């Protein structure tokens, strides 16, 4: 997202406004305002690692953009909107992950290697590789009889079609010492 | 749900893996180790687009 | 499948380590546990 000092009605603010967001969702429901619309209206930009060196990104929009005039002890400890010189804003920090790491529930609550192990094992999990498995003649195909969409999901799974073609079941799990087996 | 982005060669579906490389026409200065008679080197991997 | 079509190979200073520049470009978690750890990246 592009952040501009010009916003007559105040300080530094994101080029995209509530209007753009509604204009987009109107097109989402009607299935005019596309991704290309945001790009040609100069609200969003493409930054490589070399251009990244000369810019200042904010993590959240709302949180990293107001000012200063109690805090939930259950939440994680975050920094601040320290800088005024913000040039860009992060669309979503969860977009730093890839297709495999994107299906991990709460990866921000695990020890880093455990997340590496999952985005490896997920690749070997039975499910439904395509809805046309009955018309394909592949050496080896493994289809899980009754797949189940996960109860615990990520927002990124929408774009990954995970809910549509899942690779597991919601087993009722007990974490206990029983027979010793 | 099939995404494409792959080829069909003699029946089998093939993916071309994105191959990483160092960018060309780029000036980079490197410090050379203690045994070397040369202290620093300025390299450019100059090749046509 | 999706994950395979978004894969990278680095053929061969510290290539295997997760670089600062990899932020938002390449996946921090998804890499092989093996002798390809840090050389096989995913977008």
């Amino acid at each position: 997202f592009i952040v501009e000092d010009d916003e007559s009605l105040g300080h530094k603010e994101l080029k995209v406004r509530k209007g753009h967001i509604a204009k987009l969702m109107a097109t989402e429901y009607q299935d005019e305002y596309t991704w290309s619309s945001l790009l040609n209206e100069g609200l969003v930009e493409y930054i490589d690692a070399e251009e990244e060196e000369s810019i200042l990104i904010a993590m959240q929009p709302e949180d990293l953009e107001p000012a200063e005039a109690d805090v939930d002890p259950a939440k994680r400890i975050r920094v601040s909107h320290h800088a005024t010189t913000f040039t860009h804003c992060e669309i979503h920090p969860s977009m730093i992950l890839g297709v495999a790491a994107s299906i991990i529930p709460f990866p921000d609550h695990n020890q880093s290697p455990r997340n590496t192990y999952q985005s490896a094992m997920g690749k070997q999990a039975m499910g439904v590789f395509l809805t046309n498995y009955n018309v394909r003649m592949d050496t080896m195909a493994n289809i899980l009889y009754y797949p189940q969409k996960p109860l615990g999901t990520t927002r990124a799974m929408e774009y990954l079609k995970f809910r549509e073609l899942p690779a597991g079941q919601n087993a009722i799990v007990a974490i206990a010492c029983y027979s010793g087996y | 749900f099939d995404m494409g982005g792959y080829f069909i060669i003699n029946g089998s579906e093939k993916v071309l893996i994105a191959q990483e490389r160092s960018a060309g026409n780029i000036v980079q200065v490197f410090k050379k180790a203690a045994p070397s008679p040369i202290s620093h080197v300025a390299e450019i991997r100059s090749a046509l687009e | 499948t999706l994950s395979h079509l978004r894969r990278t190979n680095t053929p061969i200073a510290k290539p295997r380590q997760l670089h600062n520049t990899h932020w938002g470009l390449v996946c921090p978690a998804e890499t092989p546990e093996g002798q390809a750890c840090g050389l096989v990246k995913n977008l």
Binding site: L14, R17, H20, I21, W35, Q60, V99 | G5 | -
Partner: peptide, 30 residues
């Protein structure tokens, strides 16, 4: 108002718009 600033929830509408246009294997195709 249409000129109101965006929220953290709103960013998913932009992402939805990104993938609707690009898809997941855009890099291979393009």
């Amino acid at each position: 108002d249409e000129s109101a600033p965006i929220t953290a929830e709103d960013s998913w509408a932009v992402i939805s718009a990104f993938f609707r246009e690009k898809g997941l294997v855009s890099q291979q195709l393009d």
